[model samples]
Each structure stands twice: as structure tokens, then as C-alpha cells.
Target: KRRVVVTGLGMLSPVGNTVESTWKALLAGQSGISLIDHFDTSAYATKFAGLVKDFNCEDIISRKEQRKMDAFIQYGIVAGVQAMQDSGLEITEENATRIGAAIGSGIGGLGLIEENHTSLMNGGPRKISPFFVPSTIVNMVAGHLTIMYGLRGPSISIATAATSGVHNIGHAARIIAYGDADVMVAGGAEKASTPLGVGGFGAARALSTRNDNPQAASRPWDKERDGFVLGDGAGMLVLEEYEHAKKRGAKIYAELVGFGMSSDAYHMTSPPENGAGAALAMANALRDAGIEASQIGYVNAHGTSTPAGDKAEAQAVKTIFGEAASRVLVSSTKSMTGHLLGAAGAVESIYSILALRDQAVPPTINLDNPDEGCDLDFVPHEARQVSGMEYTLCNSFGFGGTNGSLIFKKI
Candidate 1:
């Protein structure tokens, strides 16, 4: 099998617009949650979210080009462009077919769906745009990337909430390891911080209502935490075969060494009580990497700030890491970023790689009151430089019990 390495990364997050900016904010223990200004949130009981602040779509893409895609696809294009530039890989005639893209989004074109549905309800059939069908499908993220870059190899999308990003990256690595492609642009994007997104999750009682202090709203594992704050963004990574990248003298970020996937098969929204499903997934990942549990130095947790998820993930961590669960530093960037739904895995994975490269773990902000059940270090509110850390794992578990975990090794 071929070796896989990451060469570039791009990000658009609640805290920052680019990878470096995001990394800096994350390390500083900054929180991106704020009162919702993307729309009128006067009616929403939970009136804040981890919204991408001061982003101008018109500034990034030509209006003509923007007209053809939806918000999700536009975000994908932005991240994909950043990743391509960062990797410095030119997909010319010589390597066009040898390049592929795998992008995922939990929900696609939500704004378009709302727009067209509202139009159809009030107006006639002619009110709907002809581009509606093509614009709303989740796979269109991959479609738009291929069209923008002229890639001819395998291109696809994963739609699983939260876990989609990790799955996309793992699948793309298999593509390269199998010699199907030389380079693969893989990650996830989401732009669902809209009325329906807020209304739907709010109705489910899944959103945090710490509206008084937006920055302190998403406190995963904190005793006072109510629920997660919705966040919207995208992250993309450029992966290349190790020898191919070395021959070209590409800058290597880290090695994608193992991937593991599993499902609860129990509930659509709630995790198994004992976290049996997540434990199995983590076990499989370590086995795939041919490593023991003690070697993992840090973890990017799926701490969603929900009462159940926070506790359950801790159970799984303890099961695998044993007493070392207390020793291994873990932080949920989600504590600040909220939950990105399907795109969470990919964006958080980029953060994980950054942690490995910098030898610093991002902090979980808003931990004023620690839950007695979640008695782990949690890298509270500040970044720390830890040496002798060579391996890291990132876990993303979604509703419907879908789970994805990846292990990254420092080169």
C-alpha cells in the first residue's frame, strides 16, 4: 500500500477565516460564539451561534460564478481553493486525471431549499429556479470542486452528520494508496446556521441557550452547560502519496495512518448508554494503525456539550486509554466552534493536525464549572506545549450513531 501525507489545509470557521488565523484563535482559548446577526433571531429562544463573522461571498467569488451554486457549494469552493493554493499542486494536463476530490456536507443548500419552497408555496410553478435541483444535493460540493479545478478522477460526497468529514478524508486516502490518484482534495463544508437550522435544532432542544454570554455558551463537560451552539464552516486538506510528495519536495504536514468507522445501531439521535459503539470504533482505529492505546498523546474529542454525548465520549475514552485517559490531553475545539454537523470532523481534523505540528493542544473554552462525571484535564482555557507527543486521534460521532475516528502520526 502507498503512504499518505497531508500537504495543505484551508479553513473557514467561526473564529477565523484561514487556517493560520483559526489556529491562532484556537490556541488562545478564544470563543467565536456570538449573538446571531446573520438574520433576525429575535424569536429564537437560543439566540446565538458560532457564526462565521464578517464574511463576504461577493469578495471571494465573482457574482456570475456565485449565481450558479448554493451557500454550501460556495463554501466548499472557498476552502478547496485555499487547499489547492496551499499545496502548490498544479493540476495541469499531466496530472488532471490523477487528481480527485471528496467533499462532504451534512445538509446541503438549506437556504436554497427554504427559498424555493417558500416561492412555491406563495407563487406559481414558474417561481422556482431551474437550477434548484442541481444546487441543493449534497454531492454538488464535490461536483463544484471538480468543475472549478478540472479534476477527472473519482469525486464524491458523504452526507453523514458530523462524521462525514472524517469519512471523506479516509476514503480519499484509500484512493491514493490504491494508486488511483496522485492527489486528493478531501474535507467537509457546511452553511446551515440559517432559520431552519436554528429552528429545527432549537425545537429538538439540542441548542444551548446561554444567550447572556455567547462566548460561554458552548462549554462541553462543564456542569452548567445546557447544549451545543450551532456553528457553520468548512475545512479542506490536500493529501498526496508520500513518495510522490517527497519527489516533488512538497511540504508534508503529517501522515494519515489509520481510519476506523462504526455505528451504534441503537438510536438515531442518542448514543448508546455505555458508549459501546464508540469504544469499538476507537479500538478498530488503534488496531488498524498497529499501535497501543498509550502511544496516543492527545485527542480532539467529539465533546458536543450535550449532557449525554459528553459523558458517553468520556466513557469510551476511559475504556480504551484506561487510567491514561486522565493523562492524555484532550480538548474539543467544538467547545468554541460549537458543532459543525457533518462538516465538524473535517474542520476539527485540520485543527488536530495543527496541534501536532505546533506541539500545542487547543483549549476547550467556557469550562467555568466542571461536571463531576467528566473529570478529565480537558486542556482548560489555555494552550500548553507538550513534548514527547508523536501521535494524535480525532473522533467525530454523529446522530444516527455513525462514528468516525482517525489517527495521525507526526513525521
Candidate 2:
């Protein structure tokens, strides 16, 4: 089988604007959640989110072109460009055809859709801008990136809610391994912090109502966790064939050894109580990697801070790894990042790769009191530096009971 490896990464996250900054803040145990200032939240139950602060899309995207793209696409382009530059992969005429893109936005341009809808209501259907459809669609993120970088192969997008990002990365690896492309710009982004974004989740009773204290609201696995806090941002990676990256002397971050996916088939908005679906995904990932569960040293859990989600994920981990589960250091970066929705997997995957590189585990902040059935060593409140850490798993479970997992092996 052809081998795949991660060469470069870029992230526009609530904690920070760049990969270095975000990873540093995460290691330091910082919270990026704050009161929702993007719009008035007095009418809503949830009034806070993990928002990307002080970001200017114009820094990477031209002002003229920026208007035609939604915020999520803008975020994806910025991160994708950064990853491409970091990888030092020059897209020459000979190799451009072999390069491709696969970026996804779970909720895709919900903010833009809301804005356009308001215009239509006030001035009729013709009031909508010509750029509205192209800008507000989910696949446009992938479309814009391919145009930006001149990638002509396998331009695709996944909209499987939270699994969108992980699925993109996983499918990108398959593309490379099967010779569809030599390289892929893959990940996910979302800017769903608009009124409808908050209102819809709030209406579903899916958001945390800890409006009184935004910073500590996303307490995954904590007994007091009410629900997930909404977050907005992007996460991207440059993936290339092992030999292709090696020939260019690229800085390899980690080996993309395994990718697994499964569906719950039981719920629309919640995971199964026994966690069978999640366990199947993890077990399949281990099988794909041809490694025993005992080999995994760390897990970037899909702990969204919801009461049911946190406990269910814990049971899933326990079921998959058995006795070795106690040896694995599991933590939820979501405890600090809130839930980035579609971008969660990619962002957390970056953190997992960094953990393998630095031999450190980022903490699940605000886990002051672990809930029942959640008995994993969550590396609570503080990051830890480990010795000789090898394999790490990044898990993302979506709203439709869609689940995905990726395993990264240190090079």
C-alpha cells in the first residue's frame, strides 16, 4: 500500500489565528470562548461562542474577491494557503494536475444565507445578490481553494456535520494512495456564529446556557456540563505521498496511518447509549493501522462538553481499548475550543499530530468534576509532557451519528 504523511498544517481557530499561536495557547490551557459580540444575543438562551478574534481575511484574500466568498470559504482559503506555503510544494505545470483539494464546511455559509434571506424578505426574491448562491453553498469552499491554488484533481467536499473535516482528510489520503493525486489540500472550516446558527442549536437544546461564564462553559466530561458551546473557525493540512514529500525534503509532521468511519443508524442528534458505533469506528481504525489498541498513547476525543456526549464517548473509548484504555491519555481539546462543528476533527487532528511531535498532551480544561461513567485519565486542566509518545488517535462524531477516526504515527 502507498503511504501517506502530513507535511504541513494551518489553522484559524478561536484560540489563535495561526497554527503556532493556536497550539501554544492550547498547551497553555487557555479558553477562547467569550460572550457573543458578533450580534445581539439577548433573545437567545446561548450567548457565547468560540469565536476567531481579530481575523482579517483581507490579509490573505483580496478585498474584491473576498466579497464573493463566504467567511467559511475565506477561512479555508487562508488556512489552505498557509499549509501549502509551509509545505514548500511548488505547483509547477507538470505537477499541478496531480495536486487537488478537498475542503468541507458542515453548515456552509449559514451566516451568508441568513443575510441574503433578510434582503429577500425586505425587497423580494430579486433583491438577493448574484453572488449569493455561489457564496453560500457548501462545496464552494473546495471550489474556491482549487481555483486559488490551481489544483485540478479530485476537488470534493464533505458535509457530514462534525465529521466533515476528518472525512475530507481521510478521503484525501485515499486519493493520494490510489494515485488519483500526488498531493491534496484537505480540511474543513465553518463560520456558523450567526443568529440562525445560535438560534437553531439553542432551539434544539444543544448549546450550553452558561452565558454567565463563557470561559468555563465547555466543560467536557464534567458533571456540570449542560451542552456544547458553538464555535467557528477552520483547520487545514497539506498531505502528500511519502516518497513525494521525502524527495523534496519536506518537514514531515506525522504519518497518516489509519482512517476509519462508521454510522450509528440509531439517532439523529445523539449517540447510542452503549457507544457501539463509536467503538466500531475506533476498532476499525486500529484494524486499518494493523496495530493493537494498546499501542495508542493518546486520544483527542470528540468530547463536545454535552452531558450525554461526554459520557458516551468515555464508554466508547473504554469499549474499544479495554484494559489499555486506562493507559491511554484521553483529553478533549473541545473543552477549550468549544465545538467548531465541521472543523472540529481537523483542528483536533492538528493538536493530536502536535502531541505526537512534542511528546505532550493538551489538557481538557474545565474538567473539574468528571461525570459518571467517564473514568479516563483526561489530562485535566493542564498539559503534560510525555516521554516517547508514539501513536495518537483523533476522533470526531457528528450529529447524524456519523463517526470518524484518524491515527497518526510519529515519524
In terms of TM-score, which candidate is strongest? Answer: 2
Q: Would you estimate the TM-scores of all the predictions?
A: 0.97, 0.99
Candidate 2, residues 1-411, lDDT tens digits: the string is 689999989999999999999999999999999998879898999999999998777667888899888889888888888898889988888988999988887899987898899999999999898999999888887788788778888888889999998999999999999999989989999999989899999999999999889999999888899999998899999999999999999999999999999999998999988888899989989999999999999999999988777778899999888887788999999888889988998898899999999998999999888876455799999999888888999999998899999999999
Which candidate comes out best when scored by lDDT? 2
lDDT per residue, candidate 1, 1-411, as tens digits?
799999989888999988999899989888888887768988987888888777666766788878777787888888888998899887789889999998989988898998889899999778998989888888887887788789998887888888899999988998999899989999998888888989988998988888888888898888888888899888999999999999889999999998888998989988987888888888888998889888898989989999888888888988989878888888899888889887899988898888889999998888777777555678888888989788899999988999988989998
Q: Give the TM-score of candidate 2.
A: 0.99
Supply candidate 2's per-residue lDDT for 207: 91
The C-alpha lDDT values of all candidates are 0.87, 0.90
**Collision count for each candidate, in order:** 2, 0
With candidate 1 superimposed using the best TM-score fit, by how many Å does residue 362's alpha carbon deviate from the native?
A: 0.8
Q: Which pairs, if any, clash in model 1?
A: 162-341, 162-342
